[PDB]
Tab-separated table of C-alpha atoms and ligand atoms in Angstrom:
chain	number	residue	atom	x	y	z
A	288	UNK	CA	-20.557	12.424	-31.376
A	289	UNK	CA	-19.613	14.748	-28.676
A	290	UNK	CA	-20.241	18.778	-28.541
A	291	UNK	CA	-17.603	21.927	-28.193
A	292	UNK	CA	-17.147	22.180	-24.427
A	293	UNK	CA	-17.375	18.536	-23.827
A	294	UNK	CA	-14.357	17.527	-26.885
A	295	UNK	CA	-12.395	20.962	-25.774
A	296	UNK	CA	-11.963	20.548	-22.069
A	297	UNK	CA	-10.958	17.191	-22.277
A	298	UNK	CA	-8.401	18.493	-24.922
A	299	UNK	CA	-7.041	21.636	-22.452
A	300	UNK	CA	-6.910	18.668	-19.445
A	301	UNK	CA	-4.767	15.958	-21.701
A	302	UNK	CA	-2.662	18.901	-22.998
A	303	UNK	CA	-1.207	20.419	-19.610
A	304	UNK	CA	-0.975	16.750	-18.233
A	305	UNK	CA	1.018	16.018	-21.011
A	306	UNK	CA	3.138	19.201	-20.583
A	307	UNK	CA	3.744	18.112	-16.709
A	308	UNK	CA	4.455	14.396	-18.117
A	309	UNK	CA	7.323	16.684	-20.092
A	310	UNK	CA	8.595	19.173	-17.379
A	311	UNK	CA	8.928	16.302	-15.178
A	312	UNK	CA	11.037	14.098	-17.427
A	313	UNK	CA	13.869	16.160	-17.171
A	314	UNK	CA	13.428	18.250	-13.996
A	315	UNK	CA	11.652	17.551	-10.454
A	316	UNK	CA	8.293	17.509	-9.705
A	317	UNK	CA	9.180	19.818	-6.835
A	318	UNK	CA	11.152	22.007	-8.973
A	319	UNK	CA	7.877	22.680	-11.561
A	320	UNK	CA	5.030	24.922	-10.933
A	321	UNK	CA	1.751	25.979	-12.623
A	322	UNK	CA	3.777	29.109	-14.195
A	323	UNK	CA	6.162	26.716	-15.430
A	324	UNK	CA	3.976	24.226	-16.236
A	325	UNK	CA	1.203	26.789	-18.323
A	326	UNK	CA	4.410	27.955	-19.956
A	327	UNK	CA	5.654	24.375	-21.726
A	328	UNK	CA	1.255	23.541	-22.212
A	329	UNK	CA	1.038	27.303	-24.004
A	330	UNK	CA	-2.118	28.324	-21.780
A	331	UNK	CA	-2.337	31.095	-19.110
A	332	UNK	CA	-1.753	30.555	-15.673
A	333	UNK	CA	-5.703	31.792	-15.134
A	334	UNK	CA	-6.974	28.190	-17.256
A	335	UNK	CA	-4.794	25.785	-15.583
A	336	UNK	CA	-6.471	26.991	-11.935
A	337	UNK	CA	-9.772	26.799	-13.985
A	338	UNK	CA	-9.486	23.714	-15.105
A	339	UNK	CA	-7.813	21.888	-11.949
A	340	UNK	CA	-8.096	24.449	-9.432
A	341	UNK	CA	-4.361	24.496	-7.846
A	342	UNK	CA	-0.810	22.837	-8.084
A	343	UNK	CA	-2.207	20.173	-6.230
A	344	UNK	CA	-5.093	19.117	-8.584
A	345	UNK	CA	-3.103	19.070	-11.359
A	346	UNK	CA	-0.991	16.806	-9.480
A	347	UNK	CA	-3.806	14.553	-8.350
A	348	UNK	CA	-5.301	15.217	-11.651
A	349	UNK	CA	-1.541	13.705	-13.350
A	350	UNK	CA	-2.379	10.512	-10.989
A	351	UNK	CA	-6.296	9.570	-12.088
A	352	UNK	CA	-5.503	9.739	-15.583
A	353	UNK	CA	-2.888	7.495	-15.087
A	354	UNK	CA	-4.577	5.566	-12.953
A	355	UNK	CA	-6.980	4.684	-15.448
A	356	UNK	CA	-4.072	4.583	-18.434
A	357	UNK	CA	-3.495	1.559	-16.551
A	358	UNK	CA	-6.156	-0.270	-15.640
A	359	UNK	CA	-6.731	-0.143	-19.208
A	360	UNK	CA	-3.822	-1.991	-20.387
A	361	UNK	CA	-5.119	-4.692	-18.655
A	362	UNK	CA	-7.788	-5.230	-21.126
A	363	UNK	CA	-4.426	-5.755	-23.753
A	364	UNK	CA	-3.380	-8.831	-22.122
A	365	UNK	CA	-6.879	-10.305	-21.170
A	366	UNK	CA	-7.518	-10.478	-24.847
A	367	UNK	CA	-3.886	-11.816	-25.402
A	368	UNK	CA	-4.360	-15.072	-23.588
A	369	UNK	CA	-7.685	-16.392	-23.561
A	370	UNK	CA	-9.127	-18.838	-21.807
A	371	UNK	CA	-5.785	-18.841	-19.803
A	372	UNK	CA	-6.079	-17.380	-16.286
A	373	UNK	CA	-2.855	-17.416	-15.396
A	374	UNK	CA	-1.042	-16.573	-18.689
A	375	UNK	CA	-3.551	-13.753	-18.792
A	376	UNK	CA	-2.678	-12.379	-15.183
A	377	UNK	CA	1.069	-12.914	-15.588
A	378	UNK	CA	1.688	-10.583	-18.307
A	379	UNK	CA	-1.399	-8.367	-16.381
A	380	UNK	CA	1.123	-7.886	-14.012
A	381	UNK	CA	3.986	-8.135	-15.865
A	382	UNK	CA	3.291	-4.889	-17.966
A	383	UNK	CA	1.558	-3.037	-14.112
A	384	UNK	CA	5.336	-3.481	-13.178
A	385	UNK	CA	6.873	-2.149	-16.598
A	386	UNK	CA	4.168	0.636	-17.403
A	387	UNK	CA	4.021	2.136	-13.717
A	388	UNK	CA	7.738	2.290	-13.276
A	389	UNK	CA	8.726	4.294	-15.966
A	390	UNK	CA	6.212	7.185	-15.095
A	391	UNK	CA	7.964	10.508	-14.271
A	392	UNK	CA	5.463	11.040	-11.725
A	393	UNK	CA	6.276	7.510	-10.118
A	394	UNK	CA	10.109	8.190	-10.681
A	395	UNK	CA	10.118	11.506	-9.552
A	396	UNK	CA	8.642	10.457	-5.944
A	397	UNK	CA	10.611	7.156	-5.709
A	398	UNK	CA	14.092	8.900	-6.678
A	399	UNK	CA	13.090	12.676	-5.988
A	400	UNK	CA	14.221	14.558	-2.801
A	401	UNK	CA	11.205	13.975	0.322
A	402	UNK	CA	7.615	15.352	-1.563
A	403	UNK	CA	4.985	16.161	1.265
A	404	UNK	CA	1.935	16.547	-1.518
A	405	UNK	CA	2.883	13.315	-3.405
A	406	UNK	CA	3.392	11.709	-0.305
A	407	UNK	CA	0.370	12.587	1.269
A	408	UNK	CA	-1.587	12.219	-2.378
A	409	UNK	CA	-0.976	8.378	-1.700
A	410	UNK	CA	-1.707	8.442	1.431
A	411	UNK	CA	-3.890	10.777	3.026
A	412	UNK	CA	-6.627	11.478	0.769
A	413	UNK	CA	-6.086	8.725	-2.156
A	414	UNK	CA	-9.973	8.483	-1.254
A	415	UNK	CA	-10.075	9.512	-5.239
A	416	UNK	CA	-7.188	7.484	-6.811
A	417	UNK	CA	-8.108	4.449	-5.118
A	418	UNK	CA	-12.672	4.466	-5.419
A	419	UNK	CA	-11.686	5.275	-8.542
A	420	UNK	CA	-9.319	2.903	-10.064
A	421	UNK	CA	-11.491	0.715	-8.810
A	422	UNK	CA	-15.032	0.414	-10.639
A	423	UNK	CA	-12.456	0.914	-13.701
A	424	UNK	CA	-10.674	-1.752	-13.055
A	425	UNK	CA	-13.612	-4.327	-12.320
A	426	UNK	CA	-15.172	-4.178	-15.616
A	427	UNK	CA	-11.896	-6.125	-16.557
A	428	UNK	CA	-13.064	-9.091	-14.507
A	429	UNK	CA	-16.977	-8.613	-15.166
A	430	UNK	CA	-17.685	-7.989	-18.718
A	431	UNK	CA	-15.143	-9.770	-20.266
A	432	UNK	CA	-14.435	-13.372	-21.030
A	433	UNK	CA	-12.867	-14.106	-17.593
A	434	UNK	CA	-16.280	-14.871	-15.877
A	435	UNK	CA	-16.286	-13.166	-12.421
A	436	UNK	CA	-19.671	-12.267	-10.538
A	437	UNK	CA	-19.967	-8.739	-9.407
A	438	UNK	CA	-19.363	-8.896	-5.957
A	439	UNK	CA	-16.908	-11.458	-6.244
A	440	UNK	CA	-15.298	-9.529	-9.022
A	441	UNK	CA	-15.302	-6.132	-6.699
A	442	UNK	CA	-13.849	-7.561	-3.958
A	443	UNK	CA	-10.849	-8.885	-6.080
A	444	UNK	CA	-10.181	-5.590	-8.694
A	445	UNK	CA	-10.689	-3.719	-5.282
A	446	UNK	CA	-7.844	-5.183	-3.735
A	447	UNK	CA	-5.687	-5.333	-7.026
A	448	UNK	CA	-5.700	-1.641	-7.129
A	449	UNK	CA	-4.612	-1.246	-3.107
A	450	UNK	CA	-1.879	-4.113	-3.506
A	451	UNK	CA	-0.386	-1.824	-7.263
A	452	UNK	CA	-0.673	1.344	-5.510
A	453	UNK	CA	1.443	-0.694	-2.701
A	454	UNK	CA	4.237	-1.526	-5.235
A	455	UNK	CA	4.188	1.854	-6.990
A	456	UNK	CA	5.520	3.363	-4.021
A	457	UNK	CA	8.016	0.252	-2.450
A	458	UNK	CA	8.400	-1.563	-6.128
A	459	UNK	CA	9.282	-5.262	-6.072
A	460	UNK	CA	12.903	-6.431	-5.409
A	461	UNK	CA	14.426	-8.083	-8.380
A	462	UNK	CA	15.341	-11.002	-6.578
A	463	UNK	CA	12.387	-12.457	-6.748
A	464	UNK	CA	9.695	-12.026	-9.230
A	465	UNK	CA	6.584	-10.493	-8.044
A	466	UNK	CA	4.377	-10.317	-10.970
A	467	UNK	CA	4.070	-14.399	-10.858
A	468	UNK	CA	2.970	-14.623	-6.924
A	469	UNK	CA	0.478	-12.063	-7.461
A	470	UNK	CA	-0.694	-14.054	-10.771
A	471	UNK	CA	-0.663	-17.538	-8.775
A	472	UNK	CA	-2.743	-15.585	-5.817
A	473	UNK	CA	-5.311	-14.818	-7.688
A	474	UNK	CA	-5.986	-17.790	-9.630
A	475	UNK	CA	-7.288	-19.769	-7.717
A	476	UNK	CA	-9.591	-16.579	-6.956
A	477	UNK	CA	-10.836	-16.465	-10.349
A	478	UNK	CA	-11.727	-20.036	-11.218
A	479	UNK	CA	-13.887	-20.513	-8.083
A	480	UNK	CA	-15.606	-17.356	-8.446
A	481	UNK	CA	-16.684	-17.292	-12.362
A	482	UNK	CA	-20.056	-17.394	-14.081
B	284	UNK	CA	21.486	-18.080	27.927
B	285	UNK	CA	20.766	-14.291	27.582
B	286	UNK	CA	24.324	-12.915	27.689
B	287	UNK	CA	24.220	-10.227	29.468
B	288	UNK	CA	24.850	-6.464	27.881
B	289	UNK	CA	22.348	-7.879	24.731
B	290	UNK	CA	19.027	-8.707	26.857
B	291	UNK	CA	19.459	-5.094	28.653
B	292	UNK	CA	19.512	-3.497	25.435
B	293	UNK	CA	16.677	-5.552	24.356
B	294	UNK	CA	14.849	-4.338	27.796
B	295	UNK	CA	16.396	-0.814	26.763
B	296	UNK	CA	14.364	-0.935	23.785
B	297	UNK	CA	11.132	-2.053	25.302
B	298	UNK	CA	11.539	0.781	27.417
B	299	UNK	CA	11.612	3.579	25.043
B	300	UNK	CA	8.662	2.359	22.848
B	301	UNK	CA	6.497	1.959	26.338
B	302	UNK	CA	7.451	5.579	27.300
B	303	UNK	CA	5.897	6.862	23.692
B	304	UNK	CA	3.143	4.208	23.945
B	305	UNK	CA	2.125	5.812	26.807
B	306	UNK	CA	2.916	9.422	25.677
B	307	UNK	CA	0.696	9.723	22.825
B	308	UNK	CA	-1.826	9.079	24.960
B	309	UNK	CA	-1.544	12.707	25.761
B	310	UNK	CA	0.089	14.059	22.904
B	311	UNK	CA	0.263	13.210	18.829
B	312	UNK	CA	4.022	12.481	17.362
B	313	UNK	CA	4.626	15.854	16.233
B	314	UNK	CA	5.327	16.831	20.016
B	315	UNK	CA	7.189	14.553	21.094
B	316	UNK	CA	11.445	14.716	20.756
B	317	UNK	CA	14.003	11.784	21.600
B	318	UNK	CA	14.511	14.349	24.513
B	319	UNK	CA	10.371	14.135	25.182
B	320	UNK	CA	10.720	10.499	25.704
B	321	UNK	CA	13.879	9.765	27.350
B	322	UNK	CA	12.450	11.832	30.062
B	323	UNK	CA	9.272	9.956	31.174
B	324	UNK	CA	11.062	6.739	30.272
B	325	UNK	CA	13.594	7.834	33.093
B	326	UNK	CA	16.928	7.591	30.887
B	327	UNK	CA	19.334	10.049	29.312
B	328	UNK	CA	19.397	12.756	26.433
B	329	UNK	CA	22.540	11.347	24.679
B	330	UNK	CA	22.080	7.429	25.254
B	331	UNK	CA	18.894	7.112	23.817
B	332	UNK	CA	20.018	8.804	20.743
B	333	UNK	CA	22.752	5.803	20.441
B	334	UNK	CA	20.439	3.134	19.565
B	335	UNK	CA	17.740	5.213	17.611
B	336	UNK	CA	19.299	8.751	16.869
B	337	UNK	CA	16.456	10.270	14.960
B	338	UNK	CA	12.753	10.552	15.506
B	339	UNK	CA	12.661	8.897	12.634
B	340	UNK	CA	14.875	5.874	13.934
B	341	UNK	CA	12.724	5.756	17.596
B	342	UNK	CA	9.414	5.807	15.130
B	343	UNK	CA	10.526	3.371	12.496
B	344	UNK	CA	11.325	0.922	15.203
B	345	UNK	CA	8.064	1.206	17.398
B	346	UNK	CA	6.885	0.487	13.970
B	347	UNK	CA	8.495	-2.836	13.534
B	348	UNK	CA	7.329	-3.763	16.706
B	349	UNK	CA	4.029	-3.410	16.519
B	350	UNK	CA	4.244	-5.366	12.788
B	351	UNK	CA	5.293	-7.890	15.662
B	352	UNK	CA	2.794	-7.904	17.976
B	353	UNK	CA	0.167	-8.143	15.029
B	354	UNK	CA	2.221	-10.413	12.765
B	355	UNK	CA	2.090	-12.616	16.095
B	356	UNK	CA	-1.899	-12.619	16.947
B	357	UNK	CA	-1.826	-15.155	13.860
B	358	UNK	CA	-0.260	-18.057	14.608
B	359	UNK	CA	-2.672	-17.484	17.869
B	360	UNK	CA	-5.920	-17.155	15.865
B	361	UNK	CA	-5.106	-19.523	12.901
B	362	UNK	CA	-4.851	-22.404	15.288
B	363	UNK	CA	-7.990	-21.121	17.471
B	364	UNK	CA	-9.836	-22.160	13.752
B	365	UNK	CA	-8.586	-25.454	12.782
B	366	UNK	CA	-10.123	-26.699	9.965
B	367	UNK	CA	-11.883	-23.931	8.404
B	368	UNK	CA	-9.915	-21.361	6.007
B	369	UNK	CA	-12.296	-18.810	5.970
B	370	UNK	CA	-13.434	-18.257	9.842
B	371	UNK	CA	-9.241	-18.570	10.670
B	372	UNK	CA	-7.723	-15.892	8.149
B	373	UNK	CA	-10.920	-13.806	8.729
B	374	UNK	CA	-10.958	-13.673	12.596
B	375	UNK	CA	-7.419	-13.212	12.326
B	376	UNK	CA	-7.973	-10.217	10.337
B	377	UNK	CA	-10.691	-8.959	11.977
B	378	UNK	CA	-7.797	-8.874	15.073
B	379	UNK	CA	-4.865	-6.935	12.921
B	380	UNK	CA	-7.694	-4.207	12.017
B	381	UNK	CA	-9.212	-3.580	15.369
B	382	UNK	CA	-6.238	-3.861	16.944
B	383	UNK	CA	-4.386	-1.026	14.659
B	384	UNK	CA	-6.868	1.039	15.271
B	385	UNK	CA	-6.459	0.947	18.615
B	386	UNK	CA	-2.939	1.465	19.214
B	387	UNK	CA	-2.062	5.171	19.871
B	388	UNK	CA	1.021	5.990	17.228
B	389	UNK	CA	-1.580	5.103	14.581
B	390	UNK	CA	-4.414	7.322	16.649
B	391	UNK	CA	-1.325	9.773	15.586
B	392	UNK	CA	-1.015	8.923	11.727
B	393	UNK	CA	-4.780	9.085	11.304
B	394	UNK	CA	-6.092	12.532	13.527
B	395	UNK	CA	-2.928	13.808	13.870
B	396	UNK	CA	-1.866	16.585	11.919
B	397	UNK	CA	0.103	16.271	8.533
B	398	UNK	CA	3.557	13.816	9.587
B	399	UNK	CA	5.666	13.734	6.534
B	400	UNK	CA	7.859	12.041	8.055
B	401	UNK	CA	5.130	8.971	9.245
B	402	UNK	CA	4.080	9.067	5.375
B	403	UNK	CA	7.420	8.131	4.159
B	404	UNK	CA	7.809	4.787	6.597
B	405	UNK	CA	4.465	3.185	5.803
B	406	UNK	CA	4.963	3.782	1.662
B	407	UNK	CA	8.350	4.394	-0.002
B	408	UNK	CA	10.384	4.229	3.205
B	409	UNK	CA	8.390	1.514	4.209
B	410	UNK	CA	10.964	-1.111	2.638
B	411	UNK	CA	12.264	-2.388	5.824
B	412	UNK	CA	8.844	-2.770	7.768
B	413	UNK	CA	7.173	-5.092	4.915
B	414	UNK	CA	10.089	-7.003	4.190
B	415	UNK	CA	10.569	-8.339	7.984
B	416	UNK	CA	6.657	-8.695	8.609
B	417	UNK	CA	7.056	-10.755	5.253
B	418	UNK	CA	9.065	-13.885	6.807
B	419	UNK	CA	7.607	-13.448	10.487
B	420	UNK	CA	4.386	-14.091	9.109
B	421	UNK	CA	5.849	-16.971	6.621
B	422	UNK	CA	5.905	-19.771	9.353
B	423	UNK	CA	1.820	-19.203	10.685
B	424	UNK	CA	0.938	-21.465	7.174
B	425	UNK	CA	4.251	-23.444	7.102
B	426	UNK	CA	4.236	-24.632	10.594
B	427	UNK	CA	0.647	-24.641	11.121
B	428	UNK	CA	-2.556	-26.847	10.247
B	429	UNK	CA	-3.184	-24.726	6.883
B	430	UNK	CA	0.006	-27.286	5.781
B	431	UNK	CA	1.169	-24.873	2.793
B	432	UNK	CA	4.300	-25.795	0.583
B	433	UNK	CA	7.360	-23.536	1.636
B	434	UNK	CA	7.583	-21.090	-0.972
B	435	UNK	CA	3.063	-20.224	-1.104
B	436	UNK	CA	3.899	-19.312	1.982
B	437	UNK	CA	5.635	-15.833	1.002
B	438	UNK	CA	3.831	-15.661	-1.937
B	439	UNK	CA	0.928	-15.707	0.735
B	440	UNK	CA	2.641	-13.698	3.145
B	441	UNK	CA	4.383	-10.739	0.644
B	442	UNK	CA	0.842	-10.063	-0.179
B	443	UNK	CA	-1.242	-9.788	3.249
B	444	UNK	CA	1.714	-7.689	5.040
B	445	UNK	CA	1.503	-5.079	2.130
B	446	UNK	CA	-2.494	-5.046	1.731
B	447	UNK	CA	-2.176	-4.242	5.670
B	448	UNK	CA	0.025	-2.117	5.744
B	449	UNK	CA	-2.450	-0.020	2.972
B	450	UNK	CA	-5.212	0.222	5.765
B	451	UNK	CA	-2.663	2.086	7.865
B	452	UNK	CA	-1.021	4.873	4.880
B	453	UNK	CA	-4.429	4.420	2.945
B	454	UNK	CA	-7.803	5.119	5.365
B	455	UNK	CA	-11.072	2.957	4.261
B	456	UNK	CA	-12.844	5.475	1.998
B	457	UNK	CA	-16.114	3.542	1.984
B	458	UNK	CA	-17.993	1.593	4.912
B	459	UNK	CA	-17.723	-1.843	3.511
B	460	UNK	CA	-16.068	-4.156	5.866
B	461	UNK	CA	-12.381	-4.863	4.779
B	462	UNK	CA	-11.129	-7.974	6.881
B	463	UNK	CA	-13.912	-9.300	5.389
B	464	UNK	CA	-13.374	-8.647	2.072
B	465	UNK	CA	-9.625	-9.727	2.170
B	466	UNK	CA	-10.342	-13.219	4.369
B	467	UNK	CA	-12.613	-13.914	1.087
B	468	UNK	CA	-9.404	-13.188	-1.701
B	469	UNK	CA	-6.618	-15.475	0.240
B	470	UNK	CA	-9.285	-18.495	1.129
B	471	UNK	CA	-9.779	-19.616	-2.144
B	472	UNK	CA	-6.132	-19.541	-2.983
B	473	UNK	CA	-5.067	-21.565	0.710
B	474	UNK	CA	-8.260	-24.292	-0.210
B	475	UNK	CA	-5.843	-25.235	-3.694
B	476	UNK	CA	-2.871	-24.380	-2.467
B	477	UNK	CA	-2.612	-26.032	1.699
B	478	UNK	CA	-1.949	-29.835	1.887
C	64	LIG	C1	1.174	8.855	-7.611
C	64	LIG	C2	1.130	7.517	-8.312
C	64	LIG	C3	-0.122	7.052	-9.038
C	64	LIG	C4	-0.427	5.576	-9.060
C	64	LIG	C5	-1.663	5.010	-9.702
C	64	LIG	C6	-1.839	3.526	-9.668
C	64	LIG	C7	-3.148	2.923	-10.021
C	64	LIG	C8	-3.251	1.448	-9.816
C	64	LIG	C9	-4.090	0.672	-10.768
C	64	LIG	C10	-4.091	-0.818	-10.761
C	64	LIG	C11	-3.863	-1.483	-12.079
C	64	LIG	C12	-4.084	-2.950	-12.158
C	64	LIG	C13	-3.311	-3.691	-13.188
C	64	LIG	C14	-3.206	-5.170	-13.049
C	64	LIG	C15	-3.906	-5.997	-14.085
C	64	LIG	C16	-3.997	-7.508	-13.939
C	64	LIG	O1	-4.941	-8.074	-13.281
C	64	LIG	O2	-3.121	-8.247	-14.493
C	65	LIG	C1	2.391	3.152	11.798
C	65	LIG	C2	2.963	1.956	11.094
C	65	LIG	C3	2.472	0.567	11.443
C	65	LIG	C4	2.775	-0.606	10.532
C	65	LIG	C5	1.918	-1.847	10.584
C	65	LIG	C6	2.308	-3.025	9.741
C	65	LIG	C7	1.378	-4.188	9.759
C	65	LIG	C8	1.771	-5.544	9.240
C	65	LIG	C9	0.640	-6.540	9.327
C	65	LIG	C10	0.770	-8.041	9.397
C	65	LIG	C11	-0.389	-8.754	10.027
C	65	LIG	C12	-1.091	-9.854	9.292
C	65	LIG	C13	-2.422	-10.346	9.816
C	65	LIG	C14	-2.911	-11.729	9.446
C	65	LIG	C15	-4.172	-12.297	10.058
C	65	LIG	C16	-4.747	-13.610	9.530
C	65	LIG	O1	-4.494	-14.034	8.348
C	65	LIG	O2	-5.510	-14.331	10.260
């Protein structure tokens, strides 16, 4: 299917960022480096520059890939509940909350001690994270069996990924539960805007 | 009935925020000190510090201010539209974007130089700033023609404080026009939802 190059980069890139989803699971994402990170992935420090090009694309680099990870579990419940809109966007949301959470990355910002690069990852320039998570995530709402149009179906994904990256960093208070509001928003979106 | 000692402090405030409103004019946030201010806003080094106390106390409170004095252009523009869903939350929008644009602490988030500090109030920090914006913004559809049952109205208003708030920490990466885009998600909800 796919040649040397093409198969064996994207094995080197899923085998550091799983080393840095290890580092970080017991230590601080300021308290890791490449050197300690090439170390725990078994590479030099020479490939992991290659590859990403610094401490801070790895770190972006950690964020895509999840990024998509989890616009892709979104696919799970839309073929759970079919025909359902609601059902389907409730447990949507419902896993968004339990998936993102439970990232060391996420963890390690929320509880960590005052980041500048992760803080300024989801800020500054999350030109990347954000155009990106996008055009992955509207496929969810176009191809599939909830009908959307395209620029209807845009518009909505588009805002789905600005409102998650919202609760990644301030998550929602257990109080109330957020996962149904957001469901019960868009809705009423969906129906109206179907093929 | 203002007793006395409160509405002073209440002017004190005002007072402070005015003095930095008018500072960054001149300067960006990272020059500026409680000591920078309470100079051109003609009051003490060591009072000033007693009802802020850090820069980070004197920023995070212009900040839920000027939540205020764009939470508070809707109520205005939602009943300059009555009837019509989409032309209401839409020019209301449009408002809330060229409006933070134009105010001067944001001129300091966006060209200024690298605040850290700024970064952790609009995202992680942010907490306090969403969560009062939240119920301020509650009433416009309660207690206005869009007549929308009590509790749609935070499940309304949650959502369009934190997708906000994203223009601000998160910059528009593309050209396509945003309070457009997010007038267009909420209408359909409000045309089910409003009685
Ligand atoms: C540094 C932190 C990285 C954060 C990356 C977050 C990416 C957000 C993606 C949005 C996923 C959308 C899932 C909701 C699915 C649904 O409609 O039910
Ligand atoms: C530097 C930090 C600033 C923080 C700004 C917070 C903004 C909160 C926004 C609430 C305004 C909502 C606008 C609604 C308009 C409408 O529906 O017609």
């Amino acid at each position: 299917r796919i040649p040397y190059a093409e198969a064996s980069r994207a094995l080197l890139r899923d085998s550091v960022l799983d080393a840095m989803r290890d580092l970080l699971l017991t230590r601080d994402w300021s308290a890791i480096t490449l050197s300690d990170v090439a170390r725990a992935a078994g590479i030099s420090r020479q490939t992991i520059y290659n590859e990403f090009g610094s401490r801070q694309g790895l770190a972006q680099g950690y964020a895509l890939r999840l990024a998509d990870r989890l616009v892709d579990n979104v696919h799970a419940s839309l073929d759970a509940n079919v025909g359902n809109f609601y059902e389907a966007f409730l447990q949507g949301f419902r896993s968004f909350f339990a998936e993102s959470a439970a990232d060391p990355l996420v963890i390690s910002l929320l509880t960590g001690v005052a980041k500048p690069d992760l803080l300024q990852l989801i800020t500054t320039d999350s030109a990347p994270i954000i155009t990106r998570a996008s055009a992955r995530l509207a496929p969810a709402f176009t191809d599939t069996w909830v009908a959307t149009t395209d620029n209807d179906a845009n518009v909505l994904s588009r805002a789905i990924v600005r409102l998650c990256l919202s609760y990644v960093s301030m998550p929602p208070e257990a109080d109330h539960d957020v996962a149904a509001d957001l469901a019960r928003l868009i809705t009423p979106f969906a129906e109206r805007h179907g093929v």
